[PDB]
């Protein structure tokens, strides 16, 4: 089993944000499983591993681009297939950063729901 925490980042401000601005921290712990796979879940996933996607603001409907940070992606142990579906895997008992993807984004003041699916993997 996995103990999963997803923690939103404090002090985010509307307007032009820094490239790769951190917006949430994923924390996955386990006493029994060595690795986990993770995918973003939304109405518009934009890559073949589910590690970048778009999310809509609750009050405005404006979209922002979100995903695992470049540093987090470089920490992946592997990309494995679960009945043909790609999941990038990472060490359990570790944290990953969810960020605003790509070049600087101009973010409208709003609340943006971020949803992830995490699954245990034994390598």
């Amino acid at each position: 089993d996995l103990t999963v925490s997803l923690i939103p980042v404090s002090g985010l401000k509307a307007g032009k944000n820094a490239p790769s601005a951190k917006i949430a921290k994923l924390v996955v712990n386990s006493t029994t499983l060595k690795e986990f796979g993770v995918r973003g879940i939304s109405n518009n996933v934009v890559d073949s591993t589910g590690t970048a996607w778009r999310v809509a603001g609750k009050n405005t409907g404006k979209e922002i681009g979100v995903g695992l940070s470049s540093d987090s992606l470089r920490r992946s142990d592997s990309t494995e297939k679960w009945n043909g579906v790609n999941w990038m895997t990472f060490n359990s008992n570790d944290t990953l950063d969810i960020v605003l993807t790509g070049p600087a984004q101009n973010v409208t003041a709003d609340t943006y729901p971020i949803t992830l699916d995490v699954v245990g993997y034994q390598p």
Partner: peptide, 19 residues
Amino acid sequence: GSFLPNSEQQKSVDAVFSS
């Protein structure tokens, strides 16, 4: 290697950008 289907979880949080 193998995935453990019973361990799959969905987690959600809100990122709030303020003026």
